[PDB]
Nucleic acid binder design. Sequence first.
RNA 1: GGAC
Length: 219
Amino acid sequence: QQLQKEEEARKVKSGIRQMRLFSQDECAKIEARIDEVVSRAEKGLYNEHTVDRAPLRNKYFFGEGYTYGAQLQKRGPGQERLYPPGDVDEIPEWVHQLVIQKLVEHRVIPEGFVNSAVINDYQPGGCIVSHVDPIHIFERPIVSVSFFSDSALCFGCKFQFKPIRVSEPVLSLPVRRGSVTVLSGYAADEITHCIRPQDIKERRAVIILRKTRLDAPRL
RNA sequence: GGAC
Ligand SMILES: O=C(O)CCC(=O)C(=O)O
Ligand SMILES: [Mn+2]
């Protein structure tokens, strides 16, 4: 039914906020700090679980990190876990001053909301498989700031492998460098979101800021 | 080049 597809896409749009908030100079300053994050990881200055490496995507966990995918035995809903307290490195002060301060000042999230800053560094062709950020781990909303290039955030995609094949998205949301994305409601809880390899044509980094639940399970 |  045209009525059915229009309703779900309407539901997904309802949970999406997106606006330009960082200028080119401000991205350049933050992107430089992101490059230093990569350098410190390759110098071994970070705790073991702070750095999660994959062929075309690295995750740098600060404040709070999580286990996902192949790191889970008997993967299923509710099987994700936080690392033990103090395991991952602290949120860097430049993340507090440059990124979170602007979000708090521009009323994107309340002050003291963020306790987890995760940086996803995508190499050209990189992706992340369709998923819902664990409801048992993270409070809503989910805030992310994009850097180094423009891309798209797709919703409701189905992944096939060998080779990687992605079905037609329910919604493709262009995310540009310096743009802030806020997910809530249906867009965050009742539909998966992903980024496709065809959307990453250059190196792209995104800083994801969240609040972990009080009852969030740890390892 | 793999979070459902
Ligand atoms: O590249 C993005 O913005 C998506 C990353 C994501 O969904 C996550 O790491 O939870
Ligand atoms: Mn996610």
